[PDB]
């Protein structure tokens, strides 16, 4: 078995990791191609 | 007292799931938002790809 | 509590679906377009 | 009895958290893979559109 303190910690750390994975994905994507100089399209 | 330890653990576990559920909902919303921005980014790149293909078409006919 | 537990299953299923959709959309790749006009 | 009812709920509560914990865990790994797939698509796309910019300039001369 797990101690209870322990299941909750795990579940807390897993929550944090998912929030951070999401944020990281959203931050990398918000690093957008629109910000590039496309004025060569002329 | 063993029953006391149990009711106290049940309340801790219930609390964790209740917090966890409000956090999952927020996470689902961010992912929905992320899907809306992924979709705007591809639409944008598809215009650029099309404009660039056509400008190369134009120029190659110098 | 039975409801907290049911809700959690419900939200996990939604998180599951939401992640799946995302990693299916981003699998429609620009590698699929014809880029041979670059020559 | 009271302790047995309480222990049924305890197990049910732990099973729940344990199930969500496994879902989070797998979903997190999947999202980390998607970040690699996402940086690879983008890297490809940067090359392609740099190629396009170079051609267009090149052709202009």
UniProtKB/Swiss-Prot annotation, chain A:
Annotated stretches, region: NEMO-binding: 36-41
Record-listed Phosphoserine modification sites: 4, 32, 39
Superkingdom to which the source organism belongs: Eukaryota
Location of this chain's protein in the cell: Cytoplasm; Nucleus; Membrane raft
Tissue expression as described in the entry: Highly expressed in heart, placenta, skeletal muscle, kidney, pancreas, spleen, thymus, prostate, testis and peripheral blood.
Record note on modification: Phosphorylated by MAP3K7/TAK1 in response to NOD1 and NOD2 signaling, promoting activation and phosphorylation of NF-kappa-B inhibitors, leading to NF-kappa-B activation. Once activated, autophosphorylates on the C-terminal serine cluster; which decreases activity and prevents prolonged activation of the inflammatory response. Ubiquitinated. Monoubiquitination involves TRIM21 that leads to inhibition of Tax-induced NF-kappa-B signaling. According to PubMed:19675099, 'Ser-163' does not serve as a monoubiquitination site. According to PubMed:16267042, ubiquitination on 'Ser-163' modulates phosphorylation on C-terminal serine residues.
Subunit (UniProt): Component of the I-kappa-B-kinase (IKK) core complex consisting of CHUK, IKBKB and IKBKG; probably four alpha/CHUK-beta/IKBKB dimers are associated with four gamma/IKBKG subunits. The IKK core complex seems to associate with regulatory or adapter proteins to form a IKK-signalosome holo-complex. The IKK complex associates with TERF2IP/RAP1, leading to promote IKK-mediated phosphorylation of RELA/p65. Part of a complex composed of NCOA2, NCOA3, CHUK/IKKA, IKBKB, IKBKG and CREBBP. Part of a 70-90 kDa complex at least consisting of CHUK/IKKA, IKBKB, NFKBIA, RELA, ELP1 and MAP3K14. (Microbial infection) Interacts with Yersinia YopJ.
Family stated for the protein in its record: Belongs to the protein kinase superfamily. Ser/Thr protein kinase family. I-kappa-B kinase subfamily.
UniProt disease link: Immunodeficiency 15B: An autosomal recessive primary immunodeficiency disorder characterized by onset in infancy of life-threatening bacterial, fungal, and viral infections and failure to thrive. Laboratory studies show hypo- or agammaglobulinemia with relatively normal numbers of B and T-cells, and impaired differentiation and activation of immune cells.
Function: Serine kinase that plays an essential role in the NF-kappa-B signaling pathway which is activated by multiple stimuli such as inflammatory cytokines, bacterial or viral products, DNA damages or other cellular stresses. Acts as a part of the canonical IKK complex in the conventional pathway of NF-kappa-B activation. Phosphorylates inhibitors of NF-kappa-B on 2 critical serine residues. These modifications allow polyubiquitination of the inhibitors and subsequent degradation by the proteasome.
Protein name in UniProt: Inhibitor of nuclear factor kappa-B kinase subunit beta
Species annotation: Homo sapiens (Human)
From Swiss-Prot, chain D:
Chain positions with Phosphoserine modification: 20, 37
Region Interaction with CHUK/IKBKB, annotated ranges: 1-61
Subcellular location, record wording: Cytoplasm; Nucleus
Superkingdom: Eukaryota
Effect of residue 20 to A: Increases formation of homodimers
Pathological condition linked to this protein in its record: Ectodermal dysplasia and immunodeficiency 1: A form of ectoderma dysplasia, a heterogeneous group of disorders due to abnormal development of two or more ectodermal structures. EDAID1 is an X-linked recessive disorder characterized by absence of sweat glands, sparse scalp hair, rare conical teeth and immunological abnormalities resulting in severe infectious diseases. Severely affected individuals may also show lymphedema, osteopetrosis, and, rarely, hematologic abnormalities. The phenotype is highly variable, and may be fatal in childhood.
Stated name of the protein: NF-kappa-B essential modulator
Organism: Homo sapiens
Residues of the full protein shown: 49 to 109 of 419
